[PDB]
Symmetry: C2
C-alpha cells in the first residue's frame, strides 16, 4: 500500500478521500483544511460514513509529521502563484505531491522560474510532483497524445468537450455567465466573474510531447445564446439570454494552425440538439476521429485520475513530472 494525505477537503478533496478509502492498496492517513467548520472533525463523519478515526488537522505540516504519508493530494487552488508554496511545503518534508491545480498540469511555459523551483526542491528531497485532473490532465492532453501513438505523422489536432451545466448551483451558473443578457455577459468577462482554466497548459503538453513549437495562442470566450427556453432548479434562460460560455483556443506556429480546443459549457444542451461528449480529430497519417458520448464526467474523472495516479507518482523519478512522463493511467482496484 501507499499512504496518502489530503490538503484541501472541498468537492474534489473530499471525493478523493472517499475514493482513497475504497482502494485496496491505498490508505487514507490524514486530511487538512483551513475551514473552521471542518477542523478537528472526523473525516468519516464529514463524508457520511460514521467515525473512521481520522481527524482533520489544523496544520498541513503537523498532519504529514504525525501520520507519515508517502504522498499528499492538494486540491486547494488553480494558480501556481498560490500553490507553489503549498507544494514546496510538502516536498521539504520528503513526501510526494499530486495536485489538481489546473496551472500545475504543464507550468514550464507559463511560469518557468516557479516550475524550476519546484523541480529543484523535489530533486533535493528525492520526491516527485504531478499536476493532473480531467481537463487539463486527461481529455484534451493525455488522451489526445496517447492517440497519436498510432500515427505515423500528425499535421493538426482539433478537439472539443461539450458538457451540461444543469446539475450545478448558482456558484457555477455565475462562473459560466448562465442566465445573463449579452451585455451582462460582456461585463462579467471584463470584471472576472465569468470560462475554463487550462487551455495553455494542455496546448503546451501536446506540443512538448509531439516535439512542436508553439509561438501564438489565441483565446476567445463567447456567450452561447439560447434560441429556446431553458429552466433548471437554479436558473431560467429566456430566448436571447445566455445559456453558457464557449471557451475556445487556437495554437499556431508560423501562421499554421496546429491545435484547436473548444469547451462550450451550457445548461441543457439537448434542448437545441447539442450532444454532450468528448471529441478528438487527429488529421495526419492516418486520420483519427474519436467520440466519447456522453462526456467523461468532470468531477468523477478528476477524483478518479488524481487517485489513480498515486502509485506511479510515488514510484517515479524525482522532480516535476507531467502526465507525459508517467505510465499509462489505470483504474486502481477497489
Amino acid at each position: 500500500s501507499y499512504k496518502v494525505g489530503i490538503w484541501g477537503f472541498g468537492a474534489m478533496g473530499s471525493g478523493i478521500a472517499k475514493n482513497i478509502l475504497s482502494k485496496k492498496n491505498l490508505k487514507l492517513v490524514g486530511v487538512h483544511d483551513f475551514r473552521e467548520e471542518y477542523i478537528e472533525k472526523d473525516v468519516g463523519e464529514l463524508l457520511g460514513l460514521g467515525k473512521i478515526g481520522i481527524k482533520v488537522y489544523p496544520d498541513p505540516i503537523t498532519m504529514v509529521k504525525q501520520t507519515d504519508p508517502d504522498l499528499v493530494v492538494i486540491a486547494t487552488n488553480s494558480f501556481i502563484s498560490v500553490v507553489k508554496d503549498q507544494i514546496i511545503s510538502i516536498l521539504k518534508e520528503n513526501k510526494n505531491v499530486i495536485t489538481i491545480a489546473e496551472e500545475m498540469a504543464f507550468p514550464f511555459s507559463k511560469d518557468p522560474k516557479a516550475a524550476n523551483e519546484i523541480d529543484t526542491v523535489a530533486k533535493d528531497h528525492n520526491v516527485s510532483v504531478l499536476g493532473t485532473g480531467v481537463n487539463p490532465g486527461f481529455v484534451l492532453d493525455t488522451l489526445i497524445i496517447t492517440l497519436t501513438g498510432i500515427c505515423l505523422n500528425v499535421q493538426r489536432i482539433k478537439a472539443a468537450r461539450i458538457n451540461d451545466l444543469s446539475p450545478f448551483g448558482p456558484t457555477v451558473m455565475e462562473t459560466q455567465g448562465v442566465g445573463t443578457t449579452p451585455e451582462e455577459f460582456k461585463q462579467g468577462i471584463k470584471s472576472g466573474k465569468i470560462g475554463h482554466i487550462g487551455f495553455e497548459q494542455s496546448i503546451h503538453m501536446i506540443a512538448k510531447a509531439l516535439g512542436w513549437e508553439i509561438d501564438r495562442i489565441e483565446q476567445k470566450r463567447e456567450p452561447i445564446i439560447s434560441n429556446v427556453m431553458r429552466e433548471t432548479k437554479y436558473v431560467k434562460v429566456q430566448p436571447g439570454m445566455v445559456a453558457g460560455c464557449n471557451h475556445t483556443a487556437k495554437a499556431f506556429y508560423k501562421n499554421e494552425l496546429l491545435i484547436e480546443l473548444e469547451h462550450p459549457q451550457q445548461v441543457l444542451p439537448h434542448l437545441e440538439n447539442v450532444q454532450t461528449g468528448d471529441y478528438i480529430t487527429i488529421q495526419g497519417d492516418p486520420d483519427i476521429s474519436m467520440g466519447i458520448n456522453p462526456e467523461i464526467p468532470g468531477g468523477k474523472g478528476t477524483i478518479a485520475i488524481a487517485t489513480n495516479m498515486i502509485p506511479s507518482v510515488v514510484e517515479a523519478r524525482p522532480g516535476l513530472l507531467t502526465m507525459v512522463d508517467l505510465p499509462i493511467p489505470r483504474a486502481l482496484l477497489a
Copy 2:
C-alpha cells in the same frame, strides 16, 4: 538519434523501416530477412527509395551497431523467444510485434522469466507491442479506466481490415480457405484466427488487479460473396475473407471482459463498416467509438516505431505497454 535494426522485412518490417527513415530522431542501420529474394539487396531499392539486407541477424547487429532491433517475424513465443534472446545476448534492446509477446507473464511465465532474466543480465529491455494486441484492445481501454472510480465490466469491438498484413497473417486467419476447410482448421489448430486475445485480457486484468479463471473463444469464417484481391492474397467468391473472433473472460462465472474482433480483407467491397468501440461499465460508464477504425498496418508500424526511444531509455527487463510512458507520434 537512436540506431535501429530490423529482423523481419515483410509487410510490417518494411513499413517500419520506411517509417524509421522518416524520423528526425531515429536512424535505420541494418535489416535481416531469411528470404533469398531479399538477401544482399539494398533496403532503399526494395522500398522504392546504402543499407544491405544481411543473411544473418547476429552479423547484422555486429556490423552496424543498433541500439535496438525490431523483430516482425512470427506470432508465437515458442518461435520468437530465441530470436529475442539472440539479440539481448548482443547487449541490444528489442521491440517485437509478436502477438504473444504483448503480455506473456500469465500464458507462459517461465519463457517470460527467461527473457526478463537475460534482458537484466545484459542491461537492456524488451517490449511486445502492435495495434492489436498492443493498443486498441489493451493500452487504450486501460488508459480510459484512468478516469474511473471503479470498473465492473469491459466490452469492446474492433471491426478490422486485413488488407495491410502479409502471408503470415493471411494463413493464421484462414484467408482464402473454403468454409469447411476453415472449420476443420480451427478444430485441428492449423488456423487460429486473431492471436492476442489472451494477452490483451491479461494486460487489462493485471492493470486493474483482476483475476481471470476462464476465457471462452469462438471463431467463425466470414465468407465472401465477391472477389477480393489484395497485395498478398486473392479471395474468390464463396471462399473465406477472414475470421469473426470473439472472446469472453470470466472470474467466477461473472463476465469481466468481452472482445469482438471480426476481421476481413477489404470489408468495404461488401459495405462492411469498420471501427473501434469500447464500453466500460463502471462508475462512471464510458462509451467510445473511433470511426473508421485505426488502420491495422499503419497503426502497428506507427506504435512499434514510436515506442523505440522509451524502450531504449527504460529500466532493464521484459516490459509491457503498461510499464512505459504514454505512446506518442515521433517527429518526422
